[PDB]
Amino acid sequence: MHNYVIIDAFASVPLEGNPVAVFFDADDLPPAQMQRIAREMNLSESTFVLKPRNGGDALIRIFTPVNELPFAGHPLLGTAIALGAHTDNHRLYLETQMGTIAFELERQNGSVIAASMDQPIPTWTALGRDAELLKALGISDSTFPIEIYHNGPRHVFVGLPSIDALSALHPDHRALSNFHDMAINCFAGAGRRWRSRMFSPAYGVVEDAATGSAAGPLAIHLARHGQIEFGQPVEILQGVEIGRPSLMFAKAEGRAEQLTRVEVSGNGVTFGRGTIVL
Amino acid sequence: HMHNYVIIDAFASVPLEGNPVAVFFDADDLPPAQMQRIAREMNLSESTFVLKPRNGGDALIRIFTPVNELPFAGHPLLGTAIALGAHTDNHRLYLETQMGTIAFELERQNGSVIAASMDQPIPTWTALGRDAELLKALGISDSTFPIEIYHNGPRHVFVGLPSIDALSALHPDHRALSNFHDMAINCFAGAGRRWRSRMFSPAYGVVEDAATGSAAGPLAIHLARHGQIEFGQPVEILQGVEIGRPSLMFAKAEGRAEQLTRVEVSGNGVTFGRGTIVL
Ligand SMILES: Nc1c(O)cccc1C(=O)O
Ligand SMILES: Nc1c(O)cccc1C(=O)O
Numbered sequence: 001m002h003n004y005v006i007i008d009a010f011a012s013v014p015l016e017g018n019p020v021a022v023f024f025d026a027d028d029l030p031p032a033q034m035q036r037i038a039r040e041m042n043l044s045e046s047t048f049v050l051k052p053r054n055g056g057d058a059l060i061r062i063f064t065p066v067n068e069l070p071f072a073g074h075p076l077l078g079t080a081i082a083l084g085a086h087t088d089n090h091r092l093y094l095e096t097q098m099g100t101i102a103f104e105l106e107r108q109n110g111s112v113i114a115a116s117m118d119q120p121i122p123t124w125t126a127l128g129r130d131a132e133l134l135k136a137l138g139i140s141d142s143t144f145p146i147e148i149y150h151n152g153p154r155h156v157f158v159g160l161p162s163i164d165a166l167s168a169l170h171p172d173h174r175a176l177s178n179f180h181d182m183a184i185n186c187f188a189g190a191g192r193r194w195r196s197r198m199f200s201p202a203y204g205v206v207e208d209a210a211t212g213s214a215a216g217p218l219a220i221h222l223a224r225h226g227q228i229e230f231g232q233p234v235e236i237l238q239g240v241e242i243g244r245p246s247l248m249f250a251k252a253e254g255r256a257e258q259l260t261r262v263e264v265s266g267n268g269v270t271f272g273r274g275t276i277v278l
Numbered sequence: 279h280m281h282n283y284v285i286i287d288a289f290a291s292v293p294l295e296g297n298p299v300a301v302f303f304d305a306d307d308l309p310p311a312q313m314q315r316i317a318r319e320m321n322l323s324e325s326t327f328v329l330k331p332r333n334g335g336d337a338l339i340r341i342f343t344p345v346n347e348l349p350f351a352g353h354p355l356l357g358t359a360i361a362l363g364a365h366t367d368n369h370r371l372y373l374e375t376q377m378g379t380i381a382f383e384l385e386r387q388n389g390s391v392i393a394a395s396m397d398q399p400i401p402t403w404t405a406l407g408r409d410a411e412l413l414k415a416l417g418i419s420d421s422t423f424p425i426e427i428y429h430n431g432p433r434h435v436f437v438g439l440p441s442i443d444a445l446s447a448l449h450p451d452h453r454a455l456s457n458f459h460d461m462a463i464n465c466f467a468g469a470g471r472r473w474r475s476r477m478f479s480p481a482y483g484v485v486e487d488a489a490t491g492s493a494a495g496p497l498a499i500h501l502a503r504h505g506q507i508e509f510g511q512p513v514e515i516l517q518g519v520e521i522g523r524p525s526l527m528f529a530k531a532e533g534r535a536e537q538l539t540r541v542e543v544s545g546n547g548v549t550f551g552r553g554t555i556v557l
Binding site (some may be wrong): 004006008036040042171172173206242243244269271272273274276277 | 283285287293294298312315316318319321322449450451452453485522523549550551552553554555556557
């Protein structure tokens with residue numbers, strides 16, 4: 001039997017943010033069973049905590065309902081918050097398929113409130129499928145060039161001219177399914193405050209509440225396109241329209257040609273705790 | 279305030295098959311607005327909330343999809359009956375709903391409730407009359423049977439496919455189906471005692487559902503009305519194969535079209551997990 005907790009990542013109260021089911025003591029489970037368990041939970045991701053193999057504190061495997069990912073932001077944030085209960089550490093190193101991810105935990109009286117991670121530095125290129133993607137999204141143009149970023153998963157960014165226009169999107173889920181191994185992140189905002197919506201048939205979700213591995217790339221994207229400075233922290237509010245408001249904090253330090261750090265942080269809270277029969 | 283829950287895989291006899299439902303106990307203190315938000319948190323096809331009875335039943339059950347309340351549903355109530363069956367030695371359980379009281383017969387084996395049978399509300403039905411729209415959303419040109427919509431609380435449309443291969447090949451347009459409000463689209467194929475189904479319902483917050491128990495009774499009626507089976511003939515309906523959640527629903531509809539006397543749906547169910555939440 002395995003214990004799990006349900007963490008609402010990128011939230012300061014239960015029922016906000018983005019849930020992740022974190023399964024402990026998972027070294028006995030084959031990956032095909034981890035995948036089926038993720039399918040059972042039907043959350044954007046479930047994670048599995050394994051003994052470390054390369055000097056971290058734990059090795060974490062991350063599954064959507066349909067596929068394994070090599071890195072993901074909300075699932076790891078929630079995993080770090082949940083594991084932080086195990087010990088008194090304030091620095092935590094979590095192994096993934098993209099390498100070891102460093103976390104700093106915000107604790108009060110030993111109790112974990114939030115965490116900050118140093119993400120993989122993404123690479124990027126032009127999508128080159130603009131007409132097709134804009135048609136699928138139901139819009140004419142992006143406000144900025146349409147580029148795809150890779151940090152394990154892949155994230156495409158499409159800019160909208162207002163928050164109302166963002167909220168008005170009704171994408172064609174089936175047309176989006178022709179965009180394999182990527183998530184589509186639509187953004188709008190100004191200055192230090194941005195809104196997002198994410199859609200990804202490829203990762204098993206019509207609309208995700210908080211796509212943490214997109215937050216770092218968005219900060220880069222906004223700085224590369226002159227809307228914020230490199231190093232300027234931004235707030236990215238995702239999931240509003242679906243009733244799952246999620247507050248992601250991001251900062252990308254360096255310059256376009258040489259990034260030094262991509263920090264994403266958030267609060268997270270426990271929604272529940274239990275045990276599965278396998 | 280805190281609440282215990284179980285996860286039942288309905289219409290399955292092993293965990294990770296069937297259709298999960300989260301059943302929350304002692305839920306009277308949750309306003310419906312919070313029950314709705316908890317159903318979205320769980321993100322299963324439904325969560326249920328067990329409330330004290332008001333009309334002579336054992337409990338009153340409220341049923342939520344990730345996006346709306348339903349007055350009746352089959353897999354969620356099967357799972358709720360199995361979960362509550364753990365708490366009693368009784369053979370029968372009476373679950374009050376917005377559609378009235380639903381009677382369950384519980385099947386036990388070596389001290390565990392392993393299955394249950396329900397008598398569903400007798401549905402009404404009519405032709406849908408939106409065939410070109412619906413067939414275009416599904417990506418097909420016609421139905422093997424008249425396209426009819428049944429109501430037993432929720433609503434279920436049935437579209438017939440000429441082979442299981444044709445059913446498995448469907449890739450419906452989720453957005454186009456969202457114009458079909460307050461209903462589920464159930465596509466079926468098979469013969470005799472053995473049928474396959476797939477269900478799609480943006481209205482009820484699901485791209486594709488693994489086991490639509492409130493569609494099982496209506497499908498048995500549909501098949502008898504259209505000459506494919508006899509009234510009273512038990513059928514096996516296998517749903518959810520293509521999404522990796524095979525679910526076996528057993529259904530029988532007794533009487534004749536002008537007067538059905540019983541619409542029975544049964545299945546196995548098993549506990550996947552259990553826990554407690556912070557509100
Ligand atoms: N939540 C995510 C998802 O649904 C797909 C891909 C990535 C994430 C994430 O949190 O990074
Ligand atoms: N599972 C169901 C769903 O997803 C929508 C409506 C009804 C049901 C059901 O099990 O009856």
